[PDB]
């Protein structure tokens, strides 16, 4: 029932080594559910390249339910190449990312009681502000509200990420991105709850912190004030996941960010790794559709877990050994 496991520390004599599909350990462990969705987004940018025209034409005939036919397609139109680091090692690091998804309103009302703030107009770009607790008390933020959300813990973790999306009670969606900082030190509230015994070793996830906050509503404001850092936001230019560097919406658990000088955008990658909390095998066909400032090296990926806080808790814990095969179209 559980998938193929990595034998660590193996090495290879070439950067790319063609292998048979029968030599990809883990290929049969992937259901392939969702892979055709990310494949069609890939083809939106690749279909007219000479090497991709035939594969993309065939790909448009596949539905997303018949994973038997999708498996036959990948085995027929692509060859897998075992991918090594330039030092010959096959092991590399898989981390994770997500897109925060909050629920808010453009006006303060009902459950929407916690503001996200733009950079305060009464202030000069890049001048140091006080800690969060005094910034919130000075009055300097009043009238600089960008939108009002559902939950102060979600707002806090949106600040940690710097960017995300707010589903508004409109029926519209607002994308927010990085709008500046008070340049004061970050201090994790999860570590605070652990260091002071309020949360057990297991449990300082975003969900465990939300639960503790639910239990201790009159302590929440003081907990958040233990982090002096404060992040501001800007509204981004106006259905599916975020758009990545390839220019297409990312697909949860089927898109990775890569170092594009090692793995060009558009490359499908068979990823063998493990799940962050249970450590079970995770064997997944993904597509290189994004990049990131921390994602540098050869066998290196950021796995896109999807939208919302369960995806973020998986992303937060992901720091797993991994193996890669790059697919190239037979063409």
Author numbering: 34 to 271, 280 to 372
Paste lines from the article.
Crystals of LtgG were grown at pH 7.5 and diffracted to 1.73 Å resolution. LtgG is comprised of two domains, a large β-barrel domain and a smaller α-/β-domain that is an insert of the larger domain. Residues proposed to form part of the catalytic site in the E. coli protein, including the catalytic aspartate (Asp343 in LtgG), together with threonine (Thr128) and tyrosine (Tyr130) residues are conserved in LtgG, suggesting a common catalytic mechanism. Most notably, the binding groove is narrower in the substrate bound structure, allowing interactions with both domains. To confirm that the aspartate at position 343 was catalytically important, we generated a Asp343Ala (D343A) mutant protein. The mutant eluted from the gel-filtration column at the same position as the wild-type enzyme indicating that it was folded correctly. Zymograms performed using equivalent concentrations of the wildtype and mutant proteins reveal a complete loss of muralytic activity as a result of the mutation, indicated by an absence of clearance under established conditions appropriate for wildtype LtgG. The D343A mutation completely abolished the complementation of cellular morphology in ∆ltgGCFD. Thus, our results proved that muralytic activity of LtgG was required for its function in B. pseudomallei.
